[PDB]
Amino acid sequence: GPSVFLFPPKPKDTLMISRTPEVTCVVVDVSHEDPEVKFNWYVDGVEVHNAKTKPREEQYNSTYRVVSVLTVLHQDWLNGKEYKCKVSNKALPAPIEKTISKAKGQPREPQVSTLPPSREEMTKNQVSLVCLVYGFYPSDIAVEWESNGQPENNYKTTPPVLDSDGSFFLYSVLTVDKSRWQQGNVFSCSVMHEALHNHYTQKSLSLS
């Protein structure tokens, strides 16, 4: 029979007031014989009605993917309201139900610290700039890097790691040409999280 998966919005979308967060209920293994799928959506047990169904998509293995999408208010999600998708279909003796919401727990402010390259790295063609982010909860977070208004794409960020005090940390490492570092270019780590002032902070870094 059909199977149901329910995905949260993306952190950035819930944190930027200029973006539109959504929750997505994906039904798979929808049969060619009963392709009709009913969706009921509930927000803290109260049924909302403004969801939209995406275009039906036939899958290379003789099944349909049927996807309902619900838009959500920034402050509702971040208030940690519970969102429920209920799926009914004829091949499904009982309606399927799934819920997600924000992870519960008092929210905690990320502490953002930048760290220049090691003297021992200065021997190399490129150097590593680290942005340590710690003491944050929940783990929902966006980290990005930039220089002179422009984004830098040559970075990698670790998945959030649960720490011994119940909060999270990660590191983001941006790799840049040594010469670019020597040239006195300011680099900046931007972090977005619900427990920051205006959901945004920025820390900078350059040769001393």
Binding site: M16, I17, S18, E146, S190, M192, H197, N198, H199, Y200
Partner: peptide, 13 residues
């Protein structure tokens, strides 16, 4: 105050 990310509005309090 207000905060922007790459020109784009983040949040205002």
């Amino acid at each position: 105050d207000c905060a922007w990310h790459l020109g784009e509005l983040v949040w205002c309090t």
